[PDB]
């Protein structure tokens, strides 16, 4: 069910790096429930999930509402890599990252979901 699977040749790495930079700019909603709140409230600019979920059904619900809100989603293959990409000390299973009016981070979100649009 991971048909937007991100490729380990550095697209995963740019995803997790932009996760970390958004974590340092506090633009980051972590975990599946808070990701779901950000997508349902429409604050979300991009959303990554983790395909290393042991039952992946517990994150399969957010591609629905991301298709409804028309925000790009993409899966990285490790919730541990996403977890310390956030800086959490636990495994983050699905992360959402928003934006503001003016930031270089918002530019990096723009180019990043341009690459996600090249996937989907």
């Amino acid at each position: 069910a991971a048909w937007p699977k991100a490729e380990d040749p550095a697209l995963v790495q740019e995803l997790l790096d932009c996760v970390q930079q958004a974590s340092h700019y506090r633009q980051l909603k972590k975990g599946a429930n808070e990701t779901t709140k950000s997508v349902n409230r429409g604050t979300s600019e991009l959303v990554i999930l983790a395909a290393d979920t042991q039952p992946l059904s517990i994150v399969l619900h957010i591609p629905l509402i991301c298709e409804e809100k028309n925000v790009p989603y993409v899966y990285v293959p490790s919730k541990v890599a996403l977890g310390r990409a956030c800086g959490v000390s636990r495994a983050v299973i699905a992360v959402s990252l928003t934006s503001n009016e003016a930031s270089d981070l918002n530019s990096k979100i723009r180019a990043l979901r341009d690459k996600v649009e090249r996937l989907a």
């Binding site: 429930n33 709140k37 039952p55 059904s57 517990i58 399969l60 619900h61």
Partner: protein, 387 residues
């Protein structure tokens, strides 16, 4: 120079001779747009050579599910052997207009003397066909009975369900409306059963003292009839009803032996046994709904039932509408639908969320995962119980 073309529609194939062909250089001209806009001019361009309906909606569903990927069927090759002339590409060919490129290549592959202009390539047959799609209601009305839009609608539900595998794993229906009717008829049997207790109890007082459990009252006042003709152990029933020897039956025949109230008549007793058969058949149907409802819910979404029980899991699935909606809600939104009480309210709300989306988005979901969810519930109950 297009000779024939092929219009494939949700009721069947139909291939048209075209004579007085289109202005292949002046297609974007406004008067040609008018002649491609009204029926009384374009119909001078198109005839109707053949129509081929669908002998069954199964043939329709295989017809979509071949023509979407772009493969012709053996009956389409049949109708084209029927209609097209026997041609190689030796000395005289036949141009056919086809709305699909791979169907064109397969159809020139099967028939060597047809040559097919596809409406993705050439705007001549794209327009000459686009206008058969505009007027193909009136163009087909003389031979196809009934509307085309319903055959389209059913064929689109059929192709969406056959492509997505919809109702093989969508069984939400049988518990939302089922808990609606279950709580509804529980209210009804409380109402009417309280009525028959009020009125036969108006005839015969102390049966309210010996026998509670309203539906067992209703069956025992179906069987006891009148105040007159009593024996305690009459026929094969009261041992299966309740206690017999020391407790109830002597209070029944003794209570009517020392009875106190008003007498009643026969047609009134017909009201109390028609109303009694009302209440006890309502209770039997309640047993049927709880049995098949709990079995079905443990066969469809077991996680909410093991962590909650099928009446309140039924109340949440009817309360949010479907497994897809309740799965789409977050944790605290399910928490919409001292601090220890609200704290464990938040914890069971969160596990009911995780149980909801694990309950829906498996194919035919299992049972032990909700079992280990209730194992976490028991060890958090123990996590407070260390106090």
């Amino acid at each position: 120079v297009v000779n024939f073309l092929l219009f494939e529609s949700a009721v069947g194939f139909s291939l048209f001779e075209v004579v007085h062909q289109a202005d292949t250089v002046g297609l974007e001209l406004p008067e040609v747009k008018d002649a491609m806009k009204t029926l009384d001019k374009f119909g001078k361009m198109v005839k109707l050579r053949s129509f081929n309906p669908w002998t069954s909606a199964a043939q329709g569903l295989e017809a979509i599910n071949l023509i979407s990927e772009g493969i012709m069927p053996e009956y389409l090759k049949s109708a084209l052997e029927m209609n097209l002339p026997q041609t190689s590409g030796k000395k005289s060919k036949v141009v056919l207009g086809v709305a699909d490129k791979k169907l064109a290549g397969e159809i020139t592959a099967a028939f060597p003397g047809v040559q097919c202009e596809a409406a993705d390539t050439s705007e001549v047959v794209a327009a000459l066909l686009r206008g058969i799609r505009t007027h193909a209601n009136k163009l087909h009305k003389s031979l196809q009975e009934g509307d085309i839009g319903r055959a389209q609608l059913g064929l689109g539900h059929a192709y969406s369900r056959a492509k997505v595998k919809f109702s093989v794993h969508k069984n939400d229906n049988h518990i939302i409306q089922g808990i609606a009717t279950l709580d509804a008829l529980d209210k009804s049997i409380n109402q009417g059963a309280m009525r028959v207790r009020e009125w036969y109890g108006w005839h015969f007082p102390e049966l309210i003292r010996i026998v509670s459990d309203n539906i067992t009252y209703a069956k025992v006042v179906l069987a006891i009839g009148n105040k007159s003709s009593l024996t305690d152990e009459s026929v094969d029933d009261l041992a299966n009803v309740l206690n017999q020897d020391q407790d109830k039956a002597l209070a029944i025949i003794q209570a009517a032996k020392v009875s106190m109230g008003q007498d009643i008549s026969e047609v009134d007793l017909q009201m109390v046994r028609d109303l009694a058969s009302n209440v006890t058949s309502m209770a039997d149907y309640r047993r049927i709904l709880a049995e098949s409802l709990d079995k079905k819910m443990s066969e469809v979404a077991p996680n909410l039932q093991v962590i909650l029980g099928t009446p309140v899991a039924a109340r949440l699935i009817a309360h949010a509408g479907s497994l897809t909606n309740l799965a789409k809600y977050p944790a605290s939104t399910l928490q919409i639908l001292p601090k220890v009480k609200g704290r464990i309210s938040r914890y069971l709300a969160n596990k009911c969320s995780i149980a909801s989306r694990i309950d829906n988005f498996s194919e035919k979901p299992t049972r032990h995962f909700g079992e280990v969810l209730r194992q976490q519930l028991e060890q958090r109950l123990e996590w407070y119980a260390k106090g």
